[PDB]
Design an enzyme around this catalytic site. Structure first.
Site, PDB file in Angstrom:
ATOM      1  N   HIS A 186      -2.516   4.955   4.954  1.00 21.15           N
ATOM      2  CA  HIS A 186      -1.463   3.798   4.769  1.00 21.15           C
ATOM      3  C   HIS A 186      -1.139   4.488   3.076  1.00 21.15           C
ATOM      4  CE1 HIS A 186      -0.367  -0.332   3.928  1.00 21.15           C
ATOM      5  NE2 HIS A 186      -0.694   0.053   3.089  1.00 21.15           N
ATOM      6  N   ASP A 226      -7.195   4.638  10.336  1.00 23.68           N
ATOM      7  CA  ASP A 226      -6.176   4.644   9.298  1.00 23.68           C
ATOM      8  C   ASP A 226      -6.887   6.383   7.931  1.00 23.68           C
ATOM      9  OD1 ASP A 226      -4.584   4.036   7.022  1.00 23.68           O
ATOM     10  OD2 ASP A 226      -6.007   2.754   6.019  1.00 23.68           O
ATOM     11  N   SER A 273      -7.890   1.513  -3.033  1.00 20.92           N
ATOM     12  CA  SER A 273      -6.972   2.011  -1.195  1.00 20.92           C
ATOM     13  C   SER A 273      -7.196   3.352  -1.006  1.00 20.92           C
ATOM     14  CB  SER A 273      -5.583   1.459  -0.956  1.00 20.92           C
ATOM     15  OG  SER A 273      -5.167   1.362   0.091  1.00 20.92           O
TER      16      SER A 273
END
Length: 378
Positions: free
Chosen positions: A178, A232, A326
């Site tokens: 991502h 991911d 993240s």
């Protein structure tokens, strides 16, 4: 009239006689480790003849110990200053501890052999390789607290926008897909507890050679409303290797075996500078400790998909996964070594965060990781 045989250590004479006479020719061989240095050659054998005056034609040529010469250096290592470099001499290589260790060390002791080269009992004349020590932080680590970069030396800060990742060797950063589906040439930084946009030229920048997105990552024309977070994960290969030190060092990977499986309640550390960016002040690193919780939770908030490739964590009220950058690393203590950390998870779930967190289960991706790193070497 006759030629005497002088002291002969270091050499052997064919033929070996007690008393030599005018015109006798002798072949002289130096013992292994010894040579006669004249001009460009280190002669190991030669002829000498007994002259009419009783002197040898090549008297005064003497066998001396070979010089293995000043030892070559190694990357991330030193060699102790040697007492001599002559035949039979001993040198000792060591790696820069504790940030590096010697890969299948012969011990790093080399000796000057008979043919003039430094050799090791097991490696022969090959020099030791000094490679990065993974997972062990210089200084170890409610809703989350203040951290120092030393608690998480593997934290890589990404900048446009703010995101994270984890350093896994000197050439590779592990991060979330991502995080990179947007920027294929990410700006990355390491080695500082604080971040300040105006102040980045002071913190050591990493340059990406290429980004490898896991093939199972579903690509979306509209990325902002992504519902599926399976697979991911991504690798960034750096142009230049990363120097390790008190503020920068990799994190270990999980093994493939079943003791790298997680039980509910297992503690993990997450870390970061936060979800909301701040352009006007300095922001210090923060961390939080979260328990693994069953996946069947992680459902309160149409509608998210969940696979065994994901780890859920958190649960109590004050818990905060936002802390929490993240692409950063969900750090669990190693089952066989309580002193080193490994990346069990990468921080997933895009913007969704708080109370419970979602993390790419790194263990199911170890094969793909090793394969990529070996098939994109140099």
């Amino acid at each position: 009239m006759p030629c005497p045989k002088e002291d002969t250590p270091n050499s052997v004479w064919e033929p070996a006689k007690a008393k030599y006479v005018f015109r006798d020719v002798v072949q002289i061989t130096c013992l292994d480790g010894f040579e006669v240095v004249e001009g460009r050659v280190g002669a190991t054998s030669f002829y000498s003849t007994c002259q009419s005056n009783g002197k040898w034609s090549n008297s005064k040529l003497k066998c001396q110990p070979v010089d293995c010469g000043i030892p070559e250096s190694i990357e991330n290592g030193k060699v102790e200053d040697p007492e001599s470099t002559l035949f039979g001499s001993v040198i000792r290589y060591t790696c820069e501890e504790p940030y590096y260790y010697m890969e299948n060390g012969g011990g790093g002791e080399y000796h000057c052999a008979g043919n003039g080269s430094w050799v090791n009992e097991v490696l022969g004349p090959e020099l030791p390789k000094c490679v990065p020590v993974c997972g062990v932080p210089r200084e170890p680590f409610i809703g989350g607290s203040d951290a120092d970069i030393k608690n998480f030396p593997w934290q890589v800060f990404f900048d446009n926008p703010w995101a994270g990742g984890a350093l896994i060797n000197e050439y590779w950063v592990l991060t979330a897909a991502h995080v990179v589906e947007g920027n294929r040439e990410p700006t990355m930084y390491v080695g500082s507890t604080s971040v300040q946009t105006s102040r980045l030229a002071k913190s050591k920048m990493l340059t990406p050679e290429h980004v490898f997105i896991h093939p199972g990552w579903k690509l979306l024309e509209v990325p902002e409303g992504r519902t599926n977070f399976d697979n991911d994960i991504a690798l960034v290969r750096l142009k230049d290797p990363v120097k390790m030190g008190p503020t920068v060092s990799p994190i270990c990977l999980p093994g493939t075996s079943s003791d790298y499986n997680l039980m509910d309640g297992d503690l993990g550390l997450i870390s970061g500078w936060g979800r909301t960016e701040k352009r006007d002040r300095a922001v210090r690193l923060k961390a939080a400790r979260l328990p693994v919780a069953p996946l069947r939770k992680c459902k309160e908030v149409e509608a998210y998909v969940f696979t065994p490739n994901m780890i859920c964590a958190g649960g109590e009220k004050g818990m905060d996964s936002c802390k929490g950058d993240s692409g950063g690393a969900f750090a669990v203590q190693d089952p066989n070594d309580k002193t080193k950390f490994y990346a069990a998870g990468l921080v997933s779930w895009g913007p969704q965060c708080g109370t419970y967190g979602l993390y790419t289960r790194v263990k199911n991706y170890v094969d793909w990781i090793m394969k990529t790193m070996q098939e994109n070497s140099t």
